[PDB]
Amino acid sequence: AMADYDTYVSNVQINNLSYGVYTSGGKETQFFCIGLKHGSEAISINAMCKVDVYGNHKQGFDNMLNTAKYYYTTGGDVRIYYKENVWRDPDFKSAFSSRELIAITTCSSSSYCMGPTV
Amino acid sequence: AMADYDTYVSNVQINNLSYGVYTSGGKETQFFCIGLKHGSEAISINAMCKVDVYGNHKQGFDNMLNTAKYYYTTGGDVRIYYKENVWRDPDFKSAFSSRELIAITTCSSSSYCMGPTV
Amino acid sequence: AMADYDTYVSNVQINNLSYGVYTSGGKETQFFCIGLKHGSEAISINAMCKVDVYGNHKQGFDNMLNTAKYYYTTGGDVRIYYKENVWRDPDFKSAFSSRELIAITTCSSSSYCMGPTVTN
Amino acid sequence: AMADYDTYVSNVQINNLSYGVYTSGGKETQFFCIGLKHGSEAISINAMCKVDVYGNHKQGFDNMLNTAKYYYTTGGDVRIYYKENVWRDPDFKSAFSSRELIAITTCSSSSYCMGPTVT
Amino acid sequence: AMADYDTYVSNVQINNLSYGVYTSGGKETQFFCIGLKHGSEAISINAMCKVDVYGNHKQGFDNMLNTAKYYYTTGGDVRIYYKENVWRDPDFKSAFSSRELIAITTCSSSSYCMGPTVTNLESD
Ligand SMILES: O=C(CO)N[C@H]1[C@H]([C@H](O)[C@H](O)CO)O[C@@](O[C@H]2[C@@H](O)[C@@H](CO)O[C@@H](O[C@H]3[C@H](O)[C@@H](O)[C@@H](O)O[C@@H]3CO)[C@@H]2O)(C(=O)O)C[C@@H]1O
Ligand SMILES: O=C(CO)N[C@H]1[C@H]([C@H](O)[C@H](O)CO)O[C@@](O[C@H]2[C@@H](O)[C@@H](CO)O[C@@H](O[C@H]3[C@H](O)[C@@H](O)[C@@H](O)O[C@@H]3CO)[C@@H]2O)(C(=O)O)C[C@@H]1O
Ligand SMILES: O=C(CO)N[C@H]1[C@H]([C@H](O)[C@H](O)CO)O[C@@](O)(C(=O)O)C[C@@H]1O
Ligand SMILES: O=C(CO)N[C@H]1[C@H]([C@H](O)[C@H](O)CO)O[C@@](O)(C(=O)O)C[C@@H]1O
């Protein structure tokens, strides 16, 4: 199976964004975080972030930000692939999330979104 | 004829998108994939991907991604040029596709799309 | 708490935007500034800027600019994190403010915007 | 006159777009090409292209691509400046065009588009 | 005052746009130019341009271009800051403009635009 693709939430919408600059662990960073909803259904797995110079995958900062902004605009249904327990700066984790954003795929129906499933 | 332009599907719409980050073969990659339909019906040649650091043509990652996102937004009729049997990571090809995305051109009628045909 | 995240204004709208190029302190700069409203409420904390080659955080100029431009388009409610007393160029500070823009987050309700809320 | 601004078509609309990656003449390239509307015909005429690593002007690939995509989206009237007899890869010329895209300007009326004119 | 911010036109709309490539002085350049109107009126100062590798401020080509395109799309009211007598190739000036685009700011009402204004009637 694809490494780091085992943990996802499907058929969600990106209903909030954050983008900022921040000194973390003595380094200058950019970060963004997405906030999720699932229609009217309460979702607790509701925030995932990406940092330009930290994380399991530093690549794709701008492209992932632009992709997240796109789905915030459309309100379309997506699947979010993420990794738990990544961010080690405790101030950041408490403010935003511990989760790293890995991938965003679209859902064309209540069952199907692109990408691997477990 | 133009090398790598002999294999295409016409009058399709990009009805799904994936963008992600992924370690493949020891390298840190970005990828995106496009999902297709043929008007009202499915097409089983229905996914094609591009990878920033692997493939026959590594250039144009951002421009191809932006172009794919554009036609996902418009739902316009397009022709997709692609190359067979490119992606060799078995987990990636199982989840997404073996095909490398080469070009996207528009169709201005049910019988005409820009670019070369066989 | 997150350094430089203790000062913010919530549930505002970006109702004006400036982008330009400018020589400041002997250096060629780009800058942008956002202007804020909060409905019809009188606000005084109403402008914040980012400069490509000066500031506490020089990274993220383009991304912050495009983010600011997006919310100017939507008119949606946002929270603005900023830092006081950054820009020293007297002409620039007089035209805009001294404040450096640190982050922009969205507000999905009257009571929620993303990001930390703890203060000093 | 401005060099490479002598040849143009005015008050046209872009009705097709192509973007791809392609090996030409031993080099990896990106290209895009625009097609122009002719009456109610589906088939475009007067296609023009730009290539990232070849041409008289290699700069501005991404900006020109995004400009062309913009006017394809709006369908607005534009003036297109181009150069004839540029692309020499026979396969590319046959599939797309020999013309290199130089500039795109808007037309605010049937009688005015920005940029220089020739008589 | 802010250097290069003393000449501007306020409450205009960007109603035309040009982008192109051009060889000048042995350098390959990009440029763009904006055309302006003041509501239903034509104005005197109605065009200004930016060039990626010439001018008083070479930085910010892409960000200025994107910003100009945005306001051409929205048709919103803006203030344009510009500098006179920058482009001194007469065939470019005849074709497009002699003025260099310095900044674009918004006008949220007919009475307010963001950005510096001159000190007084004589710009002392
Ligand atoms: O074989 C390949 C491998 O690259 N490409 C050909 C491609 C594929 O065989 C199909 O897309 C697979 O479903 O088919 C091409 O020709 C198509 C195309 O012209 C489409 C346009 O809508 O029509 C397909 O014909 C339809 C037909 O019009 C329908 O009436 C009905 O008969 O079903 C067929 C199948 O959909 C043509 O087959 C293509 O360009 O997509 C040629 C490619 O060389
Ligand atoms: O205001 C602008 C807008 O572009 N630019 C000015 C720039 C910024 O205000 C700062 O870089 C933001 O952090 O400040 C310039 O001036 C500086 C510079 O002269 C340095 C020299 O070391 O001093 C900075 O002032 C120091 C001060 O001397 C110390 O006492 C210190 O502890 O406080 C300040 C910084 O807070 C001056 O601000 C610059 O060149 O960087 C001028 C720019 O025009
Ligand atoms: O399939 C993918 C997707 O990124 N990448 C594979 C990659 C591509 O399939 C190949 O490079 C494309 O030509 O092949 C590898 O053998 C390699 O070049 O190291 C392994 C790598 O995992
Ligand atoms: O036609 C194309 C399309 O990229 N490129 C050709 C390229 C262009 O036509 C030429 O560079 C345009 O000025 O000419 C070549 O002779 C070359 O410069 O090596 C061959 C190359 O295949």
Numbering used by the authors:
A (entry chain B), B (entry chain A): 22 to 139
C (entry chain E): 22 to 141
D (entry chain D): 22 to 140
E (entry chain C): 22 to 145
Quote what the paper states about this structure.
Typhoid toxin contains two enzymatic subunits, PltA and CdtB, which dock onto a pentameric delivery platform composed of the protein PltB. It was recently reported that the same enzymatic subunits can assemble with a different delivery platform composed of the protein PltC, forming a distinct version of typhoid toxin. Here, we determined atomic-level structures of the pentameric PltC subunit, the fully assembled PltC typhoid toxin, and the PltC pentamers in complex with glycan receptors.
The ligand-bound atomic structures of PltC show an additional glycan binding site not found in PltB and glycan array analysis indicates that PltB and PltC exhibit significant differences in glycan binding specificity. In contrast, we observed that PltC binds both Neu5Ac- and Neu5Gc-terminated glycans and did not demonstrate a clear preference between the two sialic acids. As has been observed previously for PltB and ArtB, the structures of the apo and the glycan-bound forms of PltC are overall quite similar, indicating that glycan binding does not trigger large-scale conformational changes. Both structures reveal that each PltC monomer displays the canonical lateral side glycan-binding site observed in other homologous B subunits, including PltB. However, Tyr103 from PltC, which is absent in PltB, forms a direct hydrogen bond with the extra hydroxyl group of Neu5Gc and provides a structural basis for PltC to bind both Neu5Ac- and Neu5Gc-terminated glycans. Importantly, in addition to the lateral site, each PltC monomer has a second glycan-binding site located at the basal side of the protein (opposite from the face that interacts with PltA), which is formed by an additional spoon-like structure that is absent from PltB but which has also been observed in ArtB. Binding to different glycan receptors does not result in marked conformational changes in PltC. Together, these results indicate that PltC’s glycan binding specificity is largely mediated by a second glycan binding site not found in PltB, which is likely a key determinant of the different trafficking and cell targeting properties observed for the two typhoid toxins.
